Design a protein around this ligand. Structure first.
Ligand code: 20X
Ligand code: 20X
Ligand code: 20X
Ligand code: 20X
Lengths: 809, 809
């Protein structure tokens, strides 16, 4: 149907049809009379996966023969979403499969909706890992993602009576056709025990053993025949475990609980033993696998052949684990082992919020990982000796920089461990990396300035344009060809079409089609009715106070109050959509969801409002939902308090897909506005500097309440029970926080936000000028490809050159 | 190589080779350079399973179109063993696969050893279910086996320091290629809750729900293109289960524990809640599936279309569950529902030992299954009213026959429930069925004599001759053709060859080859050395006092003592092999294993004994081990106290494979001796009548100790520490039991057993006459085919005719 989806040749279509029928019969044990829609999905998935096999085997054989430097990306999260369409896109099979299934009397898009998301992450950090794997494969790097195969991913969100309910994401229930179990590479992982000192060094003894069994998932590059591996570990008890009899077998569950469930905290730290076990489990298994692969090729050459990237501090135990193996098992001297470790490891930081930082109680590490605690103490002593030598007499620097935090309970600061033990430390957007050098890691930057880098985040244009928005991809390819898909900078060529009447019309038509499709998806699966001619105002991301869904709520209520005051005045119609999950133990975030639905309950049923304003909470926001809503959006809400969102990546997805952005100068928003031009961005609010000035003076919310009548009215409505008639004081916690304990200064940006929103509405009244500004955004979105990000990691951190060359088919 | 293994045509071999390579590549994601032996096994298993698919789909479609009466065999145990060779045998693919793998440079026998046993049973009862499924498929019956898919089967036995250790049988670790998950037939099962009475009947409410997910395994008939189904249920928590958050997800394990592990008791009853849950789980899920299939075709016709066979009392809850569904859900009146239930259900009893009988405490059923308890009370009331009418004034009969047992804790006698609610009750050998009518169910037989039947057990000659003993199968087929494999009575034709010199030589040669092969298996996998010219004296079966492994031990010690007394006298050399698992909580059985190994420790290292006597404990006795040892045996030990072994089936396996039997007149031994002739059997010991006479007088072990000097010496050796020098009193429990508390009268059969064993040795000195007696045993083993057994169930209980006709290929 459309060109970027590839060729549908007669031989290909015929062979796909034959192989689909073969799998239905031999694999699924069905014929056409009894086959369920799920059966059809599986037949297609097996048919497509067959095409990966040859390329997967030869890619891995190629790395064995050429022995390049290997990149190991360690993460506790890989937020992959669905795999079927992505595989078809990267193999150029989409049109062929569409034709083949059509001839079999099946709708492929219907089949695609059957696949479960692999929801093995919470939000931005997990999705970043996934975009990175795509880009590393596309850039021909010998890269492996290593993580945990959680039996349960991020919970499915249900909304009951306006409240979030959580249910188990049993994503493996029907079996996962995209994985291959690798039982021959099963490895032991040790816990507890004690340290013995012998004539020739320490020994870690009397440990409990849990087995780590790997499952491999293919990561195909974009039409280059490269297929890399994501290896995820599953926990298994040994067979003599606990070995009255019945109970011993039942207790195997205790060991296997390690890989049972993803912790659902986003930017928040809970010091639970199970989480610590998960972190060590992935690190211990991964490092053994890395060492094994390195020997099957003298640890001096280790950093020349191995790079380990730590995705936040979650896998920080790789640093003392590597030291443990090198010193205790391989018998290297300390200083050489340390040199190897530092040159091998690099660390990426993803947040500056203090409550999100991992600080593990010493008593936990003492019991669970006694040898690692000893190694950490020794690292700290040697590091602090370096600090004392560089800054003689500066005793407070010594306590600030210590890996060991003193107080009620002694804790290990894992970020300090990561900096000390890594040759490179990076933030994820220019402003974030600057904040790290100026504030939270200032002392470290002064000691070792060469370690600190920036690597601005990106997203893959395969999933986030070609896959989710084929209509846009096609009209772009019509003018500039297909090369931009793996070289996104080529989108600059579209600046030549900003006055092109045909292109303006096509861009606007593609958006309308996406909006119509999304309006249809809402009616069918949720029975909610929306005006597709309204401005689609979208804020989708995890629920957090810093992200300020509450500021958006205040704007929504402002618009409602203005309409009620002057009902017969024209306003640009809006559909305001807010979606995102709240961490199950985060009370304020759960109250915010309830507020949003409560506002919708009033606004959506007011006859005077009509079709001019609707507020919809998008339930169960996840990767597959993002693929649907993002192409449909007109306005992207990126409204975090300046200095709080390290980068953001949702922002980049909206930019690439033809939405304009309303945002603060925070995270990557700054660089997006720089690329597009400030005139083509809706910027409002305090800058980082203004926030600093306010903190020095002291933030007084009452001042804003006293000076802004429209704000006072909203607070009075919330307090009095206007939005909760049966429970008048339902939102008292929200009001109290806004008035007395607001870390994120919601009121301080209110006036500027409302005014800026008026300017958005003004521009939307002029469709032609709205679309020209859109074209200017899409055209300058190139920098935000994760291909650019990964090429920078490769050159500036890992010491490897990317390659756009094909492997033989 | 040999004829009964089928044809190896050029087209077949070529296609097998191509498909093997295809699976190695696409399914296993390997090439020949990295492939492990396990990879090769899996490639072959997938290659073979492909051949089942068409036949499986058409068999099930045939049953749908013809709508025959369906047979449902309900069992908590299916002891299947390995599936690869069995599938090849039944599809006539063995020679073709052997040739195909040979041309690929692989040894198929080596590949076969990689497969895990499906050890989903304990012993005879579980293995009977498996032979029955084979025979039902071979006889073209529309039959389904229904059970539980245990994650852990019967434990693997390790012997450490002469003691049994248990380890978890993680048989699914690498994945099971012989099953297909059927998630679309997932059904809810209810537990706990309470009963509410409304205007129109009882309602079971406030229950907890566990999901039952089915997995289907094919059961191929012998070369008739029939493939039946064994459907096994796995327990799964619903997604909102327990739905702080982390713990709720972790607690899903509680629901899923239902299908985690097989209870390892053999002929012993433990009233544990988890076991009760397993029993209801299989019954509730199975009955819903049965009803669903019946409707997709007025409950008057239910018994015309459905038969349910209860394998012991373990699935006895089918009776009140069927009533529950018919009365509470379908709204049938009681008397009609009862009529349907009785005509649908039949019950097979497998033991007379009182400690093995299921008697569930009322308080357990009250909490777990409140509605079922009420239904059971109502069944009991109506049944006892019938008894009172038939036997007026017989108040003690009333309490004897009650389903409710009075006392300390009230219990439900599940055997009484089964008799009351079944149209047919059978024992499993003629003597056993007679004992049921005369003793434990005498009252029931008097009330309803027409219900009581005999169905003597059998074994499948596919697994237990063709598969495990191809050499014997071949020399038989040379003389009489191949028809006997599905018509075992044809073996009578071999009586014509009892004086045939060529046949005598061939029978003896096949045995020698099997013995040499088994002697080689022992050296390689266990480093134990045996004389292959010795008489192979084998007792393999679960360890139990009633089976009298202890009597065998006394004989072994007798032989050792005789040798030590007259070292230079000739004796027929023996290798005495004993194997079997002990239930983990059965102390005396564990002590018996230790005794056996302790005897071996003395006998096997005595220089004076030489190669004349060896005692070996066969570790981890299971189906795949039985397939190896049984063909190698010369003497089958079947020495249970008369009246205690209901049938035995190991006995039949040895008879079919050319061993002579030493045995008591117990279980099926009686019928075996009747078929072969008493002259061709080594019968010794008390008959049932003699045991009865001894019990009336009182059994005094001391009498035997006082009158038999050889017995006194053995007891003195055991007591003094001759067999345990470092722990002199190790065996005091054994001695004390033999002297004061022996329910099974070991001493009473000692003298006769030893004398009989002397006659065995005498015959073995004359190889030609030994072999002629063997031929007379093999020739009369026909009756003991499970094809005969199943044809009798079909005609006399189920009301269906077996068919030897082929379905189209
Ligand atoms: O789908 C059911 C089972 O599938 C198994 N995969 C097997 S047998 N081959 N895969 C081959 C493969 C080929 C190409 C791919 F791109 C990925 C996998 C998995 O090991 C198992 O964990 C899973 O439950
Ligand atoms: O760099 C990628 C993105 O990283 C995000 N961090 C996230 S999701 N941290 N989760 C931390 C976490 C902590 C404990 C957990 F149990 C789970 C997750 C940043 O907020 C965002 O600005 C940035 O764009
Ligand atoms: O082997 C890995 C997985 O295999 C799956 N089987 C699939 S995909 N097809 N089987 C088809 C089949 C064909 C012929 C047979 F005689 C049996 C099965 C099972 O459902 C799953 O529980 C198991 O873990
Ligand atoms: O009919 C077949 C065979 O049945 C046997 N019974 C067996 S194995 N009962 N197991 C009972 C059991 C009880 C509780 C459990 F948790 C497990 C098993 C008979 O002893 C044997 O003489 C006969 O040949």
């Amino acid at each position: 149907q459309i060109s970027v989806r590839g060729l549908a040749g007669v031989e290909n279509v015929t062979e796909l049809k034959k192989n689909f029928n073969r799998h239905l019969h031999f694999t699924l044990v069905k014929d056409r009379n009894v086959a369920t829609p799920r059966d059809y999905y599986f037949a297609l998935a097996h048919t497509v996966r067959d095409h990966l096999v040859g390329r997967w085997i030869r890619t891995q054989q190629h790395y064995y023969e050429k022995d390049p430097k290997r990149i190991y990306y360690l993460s506790l999260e890989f937020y992959m979403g669905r795999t079927l369409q992505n595989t078809m896109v990267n193999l150029a099979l989409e049109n062929a499969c569409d034709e083949a299934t059509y001839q079999l009397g099946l709708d492929m898009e219907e089949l695609e909706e059957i696949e479960e998301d692999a929801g093995l992450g919470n939000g931005g950090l997990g999705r970043l890992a996934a975009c990175f794997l795509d880009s590393m494969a596309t850039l021909g790097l010998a890269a492996y993602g290593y993580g945990i195969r959680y039996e349960f991913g991020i919970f499915n969100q249900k909304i009951c009576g306006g409240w979030q309910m959580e249910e188990a994401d049993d994503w493996l229930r029907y079996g996962n056709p995209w994985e291959k179990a690798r039982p021959e590479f099963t490895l032991p992982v040790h816990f507890y025990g004690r340290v013995e000192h012998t004539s020739q060094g320490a020994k870690w003894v009397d440990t409990q053993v849990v087995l780590a069994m790997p499952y491999d998932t293919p990561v195909p590059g974009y039409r280059n025949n490269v297929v890399n591996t994501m290896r995820l570990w599953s926990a298994k008890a040994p067979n003599d475990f606990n070995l009255g009899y019945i109970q011993a077998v039942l207790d195997r569950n205790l060991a296997e609980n390690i890989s049972r469930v993803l912790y659902p905290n986003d930017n928040f730290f809970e010091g639970k033993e199970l989480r610590l076990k998960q972190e060590y489990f992935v690190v211990a298994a991964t490092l053994q696998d890395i060492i094994r692969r390195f020997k099957s090729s003298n640890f001096d050459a280790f950093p020349d052949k191995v790079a380990i990237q730590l995705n936040d501090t979650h896998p920080s135990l790789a640093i003392p684990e590597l030291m443990r193996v090198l010193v205790d098992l391989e018998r290297l001297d300390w200083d050489k082992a340390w040199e190897v470790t530092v040159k091998t490891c690099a660390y990426t930081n993803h947040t500056v919020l203090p409550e999100a930082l991992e600080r593990w109680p010493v008593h936990l590490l003492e019991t669970l990982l006694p040898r690692h605690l000893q190694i950490i103490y020794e690292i700290n002593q040697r590091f602090l000796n370096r600090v004392a030598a560089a800054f003689p007499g500066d005793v407070d620097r010594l306590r600030r920089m210590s890996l060991v935090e003193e107080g009620a309970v002694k804790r290990i600061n894992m970020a300090h461990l990561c900096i000390a033990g890594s040759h490179a430390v990076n933030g994820v957007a220019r402003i974030h990396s600057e904040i790290l050098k100026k504030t939270i890691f200032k002392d470290f930057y002064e000691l070792e300035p060469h370690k600190f880098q920036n690597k601005t985040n990106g997203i893959t244009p395969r999933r986030w344009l070609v896959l989710c928005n084929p209509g846009l991809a096609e009209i772009i390819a019509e003018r500039i060809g297909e090369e931009y898909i793996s070289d996104l900078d080529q989108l600059r060529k579209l600046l030549s079409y900003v006055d092109d009447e045909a292109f303006i019309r096509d861009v606007a038509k593609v958006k309308q089609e996406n909006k119509l499709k999304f309006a249809a998806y809402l009616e069918r699966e949720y029975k909610v009715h929306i005006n597709p001619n309204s401005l689609f105002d979208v804020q989708v991301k995890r629920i957090h106070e810093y992200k300020r869904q509450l500021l958006n709520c205040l704007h929504v209520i402002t618009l409602y109050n203005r309409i009620k005051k002057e009902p017969n005045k024209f306003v640009v119609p809006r559909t305001v959509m807010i979606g995102g999950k709240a961490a199950p133990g985060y009370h304020m975030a759960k109250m915010i969801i309830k507020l949003i639905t409560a506002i919708g309950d009033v606004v959506n049923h007011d006859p005077v409002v009509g079709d001019r304003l609707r507020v919809i909470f998008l339930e169960n926001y996840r990767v597959s939902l993002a693929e649907k809503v993002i192409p449909a959006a007109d306005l992207s809400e990126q409204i975090s308090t300046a200095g709080t969102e390290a980068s953001g990546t949702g922002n980049m997805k909206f930019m690439l897909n033809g939405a304009l952005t309303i945002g603060t100068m925070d995270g990557a928003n700054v660089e997006m506005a720089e690329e597009a031009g400030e005139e083509n961005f809706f910027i409002f609010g305090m800058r980082v500097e203004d926030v600093d000035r306010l903190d020095q003076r002291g933030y007084n919310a009452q001042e804003y309440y006293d000076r802004i009548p429209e704000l006072r009215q909203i607070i009075e409505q919330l307090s009095s029970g206007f939005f909760s008639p049966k429970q008048p004081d339902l939102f008292k916690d929200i009001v109290n926080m806004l008035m007395h304990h607001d870390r994120f200064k919601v009121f301080a940006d209110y006036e500027e936000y409302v005014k800026c929103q008026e300017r958005v509405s003004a521009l939307y009244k002029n469709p032609r000028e709205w679309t020209r500004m859109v074209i200017r955004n899409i055209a300058t979105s190139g920098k935000f490809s994760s291909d650019r990000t990964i090429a920078q990691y490769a050159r500036e951190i890992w010491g490897v050159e990317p390659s756009r060359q094909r492997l033989p088919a």
